[model samples]
Target: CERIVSKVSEEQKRRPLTVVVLGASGDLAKKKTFPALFQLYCDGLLPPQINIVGYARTVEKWKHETLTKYFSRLHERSCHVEPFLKHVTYFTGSYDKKEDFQRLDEHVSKLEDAFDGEEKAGDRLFYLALPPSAFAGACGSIRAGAMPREGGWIRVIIEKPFGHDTESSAELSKAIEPFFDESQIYRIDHYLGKEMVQNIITTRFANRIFSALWNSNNIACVQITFKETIGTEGRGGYFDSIGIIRDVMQNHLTQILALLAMEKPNSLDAERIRDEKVSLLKCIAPIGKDDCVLGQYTASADGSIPGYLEDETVPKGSTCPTFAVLRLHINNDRWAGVPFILKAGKAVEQKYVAIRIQFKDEIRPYGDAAQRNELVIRAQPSEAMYMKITTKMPGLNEDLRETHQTELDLTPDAYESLISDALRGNSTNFVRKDELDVAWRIFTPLLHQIDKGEVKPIPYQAGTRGPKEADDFILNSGFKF
Candidate 1:
């Protein structure tokens, strides 16, 4: 019913890891990957003599000054910034060019040779930080040309939106499967490494009381929301092409829910934990129209802010959705009929990630029984956890009011802790191949159906919560997103 944290940390050894970063000059590299490396270096979790090779179609000016921008930005963001740029070496190469591929292989071979040709002690790690469309080609080419097999580990870290949907995801997996095994594939879902999300494990395992009520017998429903405020203006065309369903809900929310609802693993190891998640998802019923809600945004009446339709890149009569609220039903006894609502959108009022578990109310002969116990994990403006409970006012007629109840103070954002996890090669924070297959299976049908112009989208305003239909969806399900 809850996550278990049974293992402790091992000592940091002097085994240096060689990492090759794809899309070395992109957003992920600039904002997250490089800064995270700096923090890992500061914390002494990084290897003593680490070497990071960068690959792109055309090599950029890998000046020390240019790479320092990442360190500067990290310092501004409160991450422990260090001088790790000296270890960054980039090579320019295209995936299709065999000569370029040979050049990359030569660079890797030279590095291995310096360490005695990988037979003595060498590690090969490939990180794909490119866009979804480029995933297959990059992975395919890397597997075909640069994969190393010797006395060390060979790991490849892949980013999200693995493919457009189920079929594509399977195709993408098959393309890479010929090259690597499941154990070597690391599907990165950085949210899993968040301090707050990690606390979910401790909160359940560290306390027996919470885990006991995590079942359907005691819980009423679960709601998870990952909302964003900024709308796609210049990128509206691209956003419309994929929509909010695939963009946010499928990969991220499903990952979070698996953490919340997956059965307790036999052990805390990667296989056992990932197997539990995959099993829990198997019990999830296929989504139907009745269980789904789709929405598109409108312009503000005052003409201050433009809506999804008003964006220059948006088609005139595009029916692409900017908002989505869907309910999941687990058929197993522990969660049957207990709805899990997922809500996400663009251009909303507030931005945050939250999980609200509402508990059943008890009968009260004197006061109100409508007040129920609710526990929330909040990640935004500030990271915290709190439970709502009823308490009496000062010396009155025994009236009840909702109170702060309880709070968790040591809450940290995903970005805060995930930086170090990437350095440690912790598969716990990443997704398994089976996890990706299951998620895509659940979401692909709906996306393709909508893409074929079969499903109609519900409408709403730019600054609004969502479509009115979403309200009806909540009412019928007996819960809100």
Candidate 2:
């Protein structure tokens, strides 16, 4: 079996490194990308000799003062800010222009030459933080002009919402397939970088006690919940285009389910782990309109928060779903009757991410109700892993019973892990092409139904769990909660 390694290897030392953040002046790059890069730099995980460049149509819009303000939120005293900022340089370019990209490549080459001897080129990482509309043009330009020199490796990092649906996703993939090999592409899903998310593999495979009872014989149902307390706020434009299902369920929750249901891999290699996930997904029964309960949040009861329709950016009378609960079934022997309940929403009761696995109930001698055995994996607000089991009450009250379980312990953010893994050439946390294909296959038909208004989404109040029917659906799907 392969062992897990976290740091860069000697191969990285053979070449210098340059990371170009496309659309560096945009919100995504400024808010998420820069903060993550700074954290890696502070942790000493980033290559000491690497060059970090920012590319945008109007690169001048991003100033050092603006970056200083951004880093202040990330770290106090501003002492560590300049060290990371000093390595950052910006280039103005158009995504579709080969000449502009050629200039960008010249800048990267110069940096590599100054950092290393002219005899050697360096690795280049092009992180596309721009919108999906820019992907094709940016990729073509990169392939034509900005790829690393012959001796160095080139890697491209893409953001989520790979495509609107199956056909669109396939089209997007085809547009870029000729530019680079599969090994050079990294499709990022930030959830896979969560510390606890990484622990799932260790928690299962390394612990025989848990792995032994992980199948249909002992487990009856699994619920993956991702809830947020805040509405779209001002980001309703994109949220309107793709509602909660595509935004969260398709990529984030689906990846979580795959990790939870996948069979043990032959080894810890990236491809081996991904192969098992694909196998697990292939066994899933296709989700349809009936298997889904969709909701769009209304105004808060107190009238403090506005409803989805209240947003001026959202299309009037839009039928897009703001919340969704999906029931997915796996037909394989290990999970034949098991139900995986996936729930995700915006402006719900509370903010939390958790996976709850409830095992089959056991027969009791007394008439008292027996609480089912449950293993809860909490990913936020307080990361913990605790199991609940029923125990008889003391003081001679043998008829009474009570429930009773350890918690384990983020400085390295999700992006830090993701970027670090990419630098190490480990794609374990990244989405594989086959995995993406199966994910789109599972949700495309239902997504089309919603988009075409064939299925109407129910409405629920803000600050609530969801539609009442969602609870009923869960119970009907085999969950006791």
Candidate 3:
């Protein structure tokens, strides 16, 4: 905390700073955005003269749930909840209306005018926790109505479902492109902010052992998995449109795979880091039907739980996938033949996010069912990194087996990390435009096929790993273990 705080200036930071939550009445704001802001405040991490504004059409009422959801028992103690809440200014405004945003602009300026110095007034950070549909309207409103009136800078952070595909994504880009410059736009991918996810680069690059064996010469298959224990309980129609591939694979898992497969950057400078990621993503081919498997989850074994079709919001006879797996190959010198398998599913046997890097041993496959040497990095279940290697059993040599936090409440979540990064004007974790373009390019063709129902999804039981077909496809893809 001391180190992080030192990097944050208090005297200079004392300059007024206003952070606005655009979809303040929404689930994301109440559950995530506001809580993160409050936590950052509690930690002495925010600017000294910082203020937060909650804006939405619904008008503010319930912030009680945020502390309870985020702070838990801490809120029962000597928590700084009320102090943080007091600084927050809530305004009801239509996203698309220039008049509404103009009023909101006036409201915010008064906050700055009341306390800020004449030299530099408050900078503004707009977090769009709203849906993608509202992106254009809210951004345009901000552009025409609520842009900063002082020397301080301005930035907008948007959450994803960036688009359904490349075309729509491009359109989505155009919607806000006129309003904000590339630098001022922070395309937030929260996965990139996760501790272990970011650590993949450090785990691979900083460690001599892994770096030496990072390429195809020693590694056989690298699998990045994201599993959810439950189905898309709510927002069925929305989830159906933006399936597993776009929601998880294209952005989150692809980010992981890129960080895992990318060459060490020219330097740790943010641009250098992002440059390597974009370059690696370009080498990944657009997924074909043969390289992909899709699944829609069914009722649990006992049938007590509902299947995807059982969800009332889901369309009748919809062929959307609740789960998907893709085998992507990077056609580059470093990862020529190594298959990067990305698997993400809703209602799987376990809920975890793991990256498995399996080492190769083609010359010695004839030995006694020899175990594969693998490195595992887990982002879920409290951040784990361990290696599995063939070793002597405790009874004087010879048996082979492979083996494997509490979630934090008060600690800064990914949202906090990303919000802080945007505040400090660090582009490291935010998705770059080229990065988004390349990401959509990699998944768009396959998405079109799925949309056409040409690539139909098989049904898998809710409690199981995935469909038998999914396992068969993985086996057929020649990825062992």
> Which candidate number has the best TM-score?
2
Q: lDDT (0-100) at residue 131 of candidate 1?
A: 80
By summed lDDT, the worst window of 10 consecutive residues in model 1 runs over: 1-10
Per-residue lDDT over 1-481 for candidate 2, one digit per residue giving the tens place of the 0 to 100 score: 1222325455566677999999988888887888888777776677667789988887333556565546533434346666667788988878789999899888888888887554457889989999987888889999998888888889999978779899998888888888887799999999999998899999899988899999999998999999999998867877988988888898999998899989999799998998899999999877999999999999989887799888989988799898999999898988998989999988999999999999988766432456677888999777888887765554455434542322222126788899889988899999988889899999989998998998788999999999999999999998886
- lDDT of candidates 1 onward, in order: 0.72, 0.85, 0.81
Number of the predicted model whose lDDT against the real structure is largest: 2
TM-score of model 2 vs. true structure: 0.92
Can you write out model 3's per-residue Cα lDDT over 1-481, one digit (the tens) per residue?
1222334665446567889998887889878888788777766678666778888887224556543365532634335666667788888878789999889888988888866566446789999989989998888888998888757788999988788799999889988888888889998888988998878888788879878999988888888999988788766887988889888899899888888888899678888888899999999888888998899999998875579998889998898999898999899999998888899999988889999888885356335545567788887866777776554444543434321101212124898888888888888888888899988998999999888989889998898989787777776665675
- lDDT per residue as tens, model 1, 1-481: 1222222243323334578878877778766766566555555556555677877775235534555565543424333333355566788877445466567777877665655222435667777768867766776677667766455667877777667888888888887787778877877776786666777766776678887888988788898898777778668999988898888788888888888888887678867878888998888876776678888877855565587887778888787888888899888878987989988888776788888898876556423534667888886656778877665443545334423234333332354355345545567777788888888888777787788877777767777777888878876886633
Error of 2 at 44 (Å): 0.8
Name the regions of candidate 1 deviating beyond 4 angstroms: 1-15, 59-61, 72-83, 97-102, 112-120, 366-370, 396-425
Angstrom error of the Cα, residue 86, model 3: value is 2.9
Clashes of 2: 0
Candidate 1 accuracy as lDDT:
0.72
Query: In terms of TM-score, which candidate is stronger, 2 or 3?
Result: 2
Q: Candidate 1 or 2, higher TM-score? A: 2
